[PDB]
A paper describes a structure:
Chloride Intracellular Channel (CLIC) family members uniquely transition between soluble and membrane-associated conformations. Here, we expose the function of CLIC5 as a fusogen. We demonstrate that purified CLIC5 directly interacts with the membrane and induces fusion, as reflected by increased liposomal diameter and lipid and content mixing between liposomes.
Of note, to facilitate the crystallization of F34D, a small flexible loop (residues 57-68) was removed (CLIC5–Δloop). Despite the marked functional effect conferred by the F34D mutation, the static high-resolution structure of the compact conformation reveals no significant differences between WT and F34D. R37 is within a salt-bridge distance (3.7 Å), while K191 is not captured interacting with D34 in the static structure. Notably, while CLIC5-WT and F34D share a similar HDX profile at pH 7.5, the WT protein exhibits a much higher exchange at pH 5.5, indicating that the F34D mutation decreases the conformational heterogeneity of CLIC5 in solution. Together, these data indicate that F34 is critical for the function of CLIC5 as a fusogen.
Residue numbers in the entry: 25 to 251
The structure:
């Protein structure tokens, strides 16, 4: 861990964190590992974020994630992988559903696309509200016999969170700005998940500005013009 330089996307200001979920993903991982590293916002354009370890460039985001978990190990660094297989697949279809929802221009399809995103969101809400086996044994579940854990896998942030949280945040900001869509408040688990993230510095200080995210989708998202 002698040399760790992280190159994330830069915002319109040229210095701030720009909208790039993959960037926030790796940023959060390094932060949660407690390792010494440097961040440099650069104009990556369409190029993905990357990092250099001891001068050697690392590429991909999934491959970079595997390297960091395999290199920064106990006892000096905490293992950040999720213990439950289900935690790594919750909400995987959300971003895809959201993108098709906000990229649509025909009003005749809006309703269906919206239900698509909502259903994807409810599945994620369901997992977060269903107590994990540990909580059931521990009797760590609420009076509603409902899960009250803070994140996907448990009460500690994991690689699954570093991957999902940035996309989920983007979905919330953009879908609201360009469709006036709100993640229903009845999805108590999902909202409790999001609020917990906003309380942790590792997500807050690695997060792009609401205006930055919105401006980023100004061309991507389309207005429901055609019937």
């Amino acid at each position: 861990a002698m040399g760790i330089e992280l190159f994330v996307k830069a915002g319109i200001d040229g210095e701030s964190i720009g909208n790039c979920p993959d960037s926030q993903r790796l940023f959060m991982i390094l932060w949660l590992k407690g390792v010494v590293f440097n961040v440099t916002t650069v104009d990556l354009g369409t190029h993905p974020p990357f990092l250099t370890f001891n001068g050697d460039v690392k590429t991909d985001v999934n491959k970079i994630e595997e390297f960091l978990e395999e290199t920064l190990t106990p006892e000096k660094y905490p293992k950040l992988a999720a213990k439950h297989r289900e935690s790594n697949t919750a909400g995987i279809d959300i971003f895809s559903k959201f993108s098709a929802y906000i990229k649509n221009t025909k009003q005749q399809n809006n309703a269906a696309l919206e239900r698509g995103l909502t259903k994807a969101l409810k599945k994620l809400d369901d997992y977060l509200n269903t107590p994990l086996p540990e909580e059931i044994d521990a009797n760590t579940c609420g009076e509603d016999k409902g899960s009250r854990r803070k994140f996907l896998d448990g009460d500690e942030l994991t690689l699954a969170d570093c991957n999902l949280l940035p996309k989920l945040h983007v979905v919330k900001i953009v879908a609201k700005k360009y469709r006036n869509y709100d993640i229903p408040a009845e999805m108590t688990g999902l909202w409790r998940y999001l609020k917990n993230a906003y309380a942790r510095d590792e997500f807050t200080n690695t997060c792009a500005a609401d205006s930055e995210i919105e401006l980023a989708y100004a061309d991507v998202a389309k207005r429901l013009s055609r019937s």
